[PDB]
Design a protein around this ligand. Sequence first.
Ligand SMILES: CC(=O)N1CCc2c(c(N3CCCc4cc(-c5cnn(C)c5)ccc43)nn2[C@H]2CCOC2)C1
Length: 114
Amino acid sequence: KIFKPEELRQALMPTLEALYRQDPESLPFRQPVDPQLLGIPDYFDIVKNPMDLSTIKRKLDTGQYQEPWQYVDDVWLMFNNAWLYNRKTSRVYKFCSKLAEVFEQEIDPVMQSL
Ligand SMILES: CC(=O)N1CCc2c(c(N3CCCc4cc(-c5cnn(C)c5)ccc43)nn2[C@H]2CCOC2)C1
């Protein structure tokens, strides 16, 4: 079907806010990865399509999602990037796993409502 921009925003923005509310777990994901600042210059060799919470928020606010699954795909791109780049023992990897648990919990009832 057809989704209006504000219908998508009202439904999906709370699920994004649920990720931001995870502290410390959302902190590595709030801004685009800056490999030079972080000392990890191999990042863009490994992660070809970067994604983060700030970019998803902007796309939601600017109507760049036409369907809910496009938003879900970006959130999952952010997760899969972090599980790919970071080691299983690292903070970022474990924080990613926590965010994915929280997102799964919140997005399910929202998809039902849409
Ligand atoms: C998402 C992702 O793939 N990244 C690539 C790797 C990475 C990223 C962060 N960042 C991003 C800036 C904010 C941040 C905050 C924390 C934090 C805050 N509070 N606590 C308890 C932890 C941890 C990591 C990060 N560091 N590194 C590595 C460099 C050395 O450390 C690990 C992002």
